[PDB]
Design a protein around this motif. Structure first.
Motif, PDB file in Angstrom:
ATOM      1  N   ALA A  88     -45.204  54.432  40.620  1.00 49.35           N
ATOM      2  CA  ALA A  88     -45.372  55.827  41.015  1.00 49.35           C
ATOM      3  C   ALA A  88     -46.579  56.401  40.284  1.00 49.35           C
ATOM      4  CB  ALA A  88     -44.120  56.632  40.715  1.00 49.35           C
ATOM      5  N   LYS A 148     -48.806  59.568  40.195  1.00 50.46           N
ATOM      6  CA  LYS A 148     -48.930  60.955  40.619  1.00 50.46           C
ATOM      7  C   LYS A 148     -49.876  61.677  39.684  1.00 50.46           C
ATOM      8  CE  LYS A 148     -44.087  60.846  41.813  1.00 50.46           C
ATOM      9  NZ  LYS A 148     -42.805  61.258  41.184  1.00 50.46           N
ATOM     10  N   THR A 149     -50.864  62.363  40.240  1.00 45.52           N
ATOM     11  CA  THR A 149     -51.797  63.082  39.384  1.00 45.52           C
ATOM     12  C   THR A 149     -51.229  64.412  38.894  1.00 45.52           C
ATOM     13  OG1 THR A 149     -53.558  62.032  40.635  1.00 45.52           O
ATOM     14  CG2 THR A 149     -54.172  63.802  39.172  1.00 45.52           C
ATOM     15  N   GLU A 165     -47.363  66.944  39.154  1.00 42.66           N
ATOM     16  CA  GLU A 165     -46.018  67.096  39.703  1.00 42.66           C
ATOM     17  C   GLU A 165     -45.337  68.279  39.029  1.00 42.66           C
ATOM     18  OE1 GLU A 165     -43.665  63.640  39.392  1.00 42.66           O
ATOM     19  OE2 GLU A 165     -41.888  64.561  40.291  1.00 42.66           O
ATOM     20  N   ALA A 209     -44.839  54.312  35.841  1.00 41.60           N
ATOM     21  CA  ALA A 209     -45.028  55.706  36.232  1.00 41.60           C
ATOM     22  C   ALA A 209     -46.244  56.258  35.504  1.00 41.60           C
ATOM     23  CB  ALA A 209     -43.788  56.528  35.930  1.00 41.60           C
ATOM     24  N   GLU A 210     -47.374  56.318  36.192  1.00 38.40           N
ATOM     25  CA  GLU A 210     -48.569  56.974  35.681  1.00 38.40           C
ATOM     26  C   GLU A 210     -48.629  58.380  36.266  1.00 38.40           C
ATOM     27  OE1 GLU A 210     -52.257  54.784  35.904  1.00 38.40           O
ATOM     28  OE2 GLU A 210     -51.199  52.875  36.036  1.00 38.40           O
ATOM     29  N   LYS A 211     -48.519  59.393  35.412  1.00 36.88           N
ATOM     30  CA  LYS A 211     -48.662  60.778  35.833  1.00 36.88           C
ATOM     31  C   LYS A 211     -49.621  61.484  34.898  1.00 36.88           C
ATOM     32  CE  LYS A 211     -43.817  60.744  37.019  1.00 36.88           C
ATOM     33  NZ  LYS A 211     -42.542  61.175  36.388  1.00 36.88           N
ATOM     34  N   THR A 212     -50.619  62.156  35.455  1.00 31.55           N
ATOM     35  CA  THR A 212     -51.563  62.860  34.599  1.00 31.55           C
ATOM     36  C   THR A 212     -51.017  64.198  34.106  1.00 31.55           C
ATOM     37  OG1 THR A 212     -53.306  61.786  35.854  1.00 31.55           O
ATOM     38  CG2 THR A 212     -53.949  63.543  34.390  1.00 31.55           C
ATOM     39  N   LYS A 213     -50.116  64.830  34.849  1.00 37.20           N
ATOM     40  CA  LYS A 213     -49.487  66.048  34.366  1.00 37.20           C
ATOM     41  C   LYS A 213     -48.157  66.225  35.069  1.00 37.20           C
ATOM     42  CE  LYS A 213     -50.077  70.978  34.852  1.00 37.20           C
ATOM     43  NZ  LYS A 213     -50.976  72.145  34.675  1.00 37.20           N
ATOM     44  N   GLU A 214     -47.188  66.787  34.353  1.00 39.51           N
ATOM     45  CA  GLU A 214     -45.845  66.960  34.901  1.00 39.51           C
ATOM     46  C   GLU A 214     -45.183  68.152  34.223  1.00 39.51           C
ATOM     47  OE1 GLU A 214     -43.440  63.539  34.593  1.00 39.51           O
ATOM     48  OE2 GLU A 214     -41.675  64.489  35.487  1.00 39.51           O
ATOM     49  N   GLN A 215     -44.943  69.222  34.981  1.00 37.72           N
ATOM     50  CA  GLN A 215     -44.343  70.441  34.467  1.00 37.72           C
ATOM     51  C   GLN A 215     -42.978  70.673  35.086  1.00 37.72           C
ATOM     52  OE1 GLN A 215     -46.874  73.847  34.932  1.00 37.72           O
ATOM     53  NE2 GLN A 215     -48.278  73.080  33.364  1.00 37.72           N
ATOM     54  N   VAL A 253     -42.601  51.447  32.000  1.00 38.88           N
ATOM     55  CA  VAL A 253     -43.815  51.954  31.381  1.00 38.88           C
ATOM     56  C   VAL A 253     -44.047  53.358  31.911  1.00 38.88           C
ATOM     57  CG1 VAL A 253     -46.292  51.704  31.240  1.00 38.88           C
ATOM     58  CG2 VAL A 253     -44.868  49.756  30.952  1.00 38.88           C
ATOM     59  N   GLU A 269     -46.910  56.269  31.365  1.00 40.36           N
ATOM     60  CA  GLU A 269     -48.112  56.911  30.853  1.00 40.36           C
ATOM     61  C   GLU A 269     -48.189  58.317  31.437  1.00 40.36           C
ATOM     62  OE1 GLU A 269     -51.774  54.679  31.074  1.00 40.36           O
ATOM     63  OE2 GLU A 269     -50.694  52.781  31.208  1.00 40.36           O
ATOM     64  N   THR A 326     -50.223  62.069  30.623  1.00 38.70           N
ATOM     65  CA  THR A 326     -51.174  62.761  29.766  1.00 38.70           C
ATOM     66  C   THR A 326     -50.644  64.105  29.272  1.00 38.70           C
ATOM     67  OG1 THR A 326     -52.906  61.667  31.021  1.00 38.70           O
ATOM     68  CG2 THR A 326     -53.568  63.415  29.554  1.00 38.70           C
ATOM     69  N   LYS A 327     -49.751  64.748  30.015  1.00 39.73           N
ATOM     70  CA  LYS A 327     -49.137  65.973  29.532  1.00 39.73           C
ATOM     71  C   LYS A 327     -47.809  66.166  30.237  1.00 39.73           C
ATOM     72  CE  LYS A 327     -49.786  70.896  30.016  1.00 39.73           C
ATOM     73  NZ  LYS A 327     -50.699  72.053  29.838  1.00 39.73           N
ATOM     74  N   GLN A 337     -44.631  69.201  30.150  1.00 39.01           N
ATOM     75  CA  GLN A 337     -44.045  70.427  29.637  1.00 39.01           C
ATOM     76  C   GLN A 337     -42.682  70.675  30.257  1.00 39.01           C
ATOM     77  OE1 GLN A 337     -46.616  73.804  30.098  1.00 39.01           O
ATOM     78  NE2 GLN A 337     -48.011  73.018  28.529  1.00 39.01           N
TER      79      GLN A 337
END
Lengths: 61, 61, 61, 61, 61, 61
Positions: free
Chosen positions: A20, A22-23, A25, B20-26, C19, C21, C23-24, C26
């Motif tokens: 997965a 996702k840039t 979410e 799971a690669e996510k650059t941001k998750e709120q 895994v 990854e 980057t942020k 909240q």
């Protein structure tokens, strides 16, 4: 009077590969219910109600 | 009077590979319920209600 | 009068590689319930209600 | 006359989760070469021949 | 006269989750070469021949 | 006279999830070459011959 289980499987998940990317979410709940992203989940219930991902709204009486 | 289990599996998860690669998750909850990201979860209940990821809204009476 | 379990598995998780990854990440809860990131969890209950990831909103009476 | 690297990565392995359940594993070499089970290996060579897992048979002259 | 790398990646492996359940695994080499099970391997070579998993048979002259 | 790389990727593997359930796996080499099971491998070569999984038979002269 006789019960022979053998390699029985019930409520089972196996051999699962997920990716997965996702840039971004977001989730913005205001006063309700939210259920997101349930993967590789298994359950077995005997004599009871079974729910996996059950988002119920507000209950009143 | 006789019960022979053998290699029985119930409520089981096995052999699971996730990425799971996510650059941001709120998540921004305001007064409700939120359930996010449930992976590789297994449960078995006997004589009871079973829930895995159950976000219930507010209850009133 | 007879019960022979053997290599039985109940409410079990095994062989899981993950895994994550990010980057942020909240979480901003205001007066509710939030449950995030439940992985590789197993439970078994006898004669009781079983919940794994259950975010319940506020209860009133 | 100018070279500005920044967060460069070369010959790099990172963020790797592996699980290996094996009930039995044999190797029976008789007079050759054997290379087994190379995981999470990184190398960088400048002005030289580079080999990671190179099983060479017998050399003669 | 000017070279500005930035977040460059070369010969790189990242974010890899693997699971390998094997009940039995044999290797029986007799006088040759064998290379088995190479995972998550990265290499970079400058001015040289590069081989990752190269099983060469016997060399003669 | 000017070269500006940015988030360049070369010879790269990322975000890979694999599962391999095998009940039995044999290899029986007699005097040759064998290469088995190469996963998530990355390489970059400058001014050299590059081989990843190259099983060469016997060489003679």
């Amino acid at each position: 009077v006789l019960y022979v289980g053998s390699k029985t499987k019930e409520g089972v998940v196996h051999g699962v590969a997920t990716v997965a990317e996702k840039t971004k979410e977001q989730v913005t709940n205001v006063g309700g219910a939210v259920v997101t992203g349930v993967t590789a989940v298994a359950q077995k219930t005997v004599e009871g109600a079974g729910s996996i991902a059950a988002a119920t709204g507000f209950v009143k009486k």
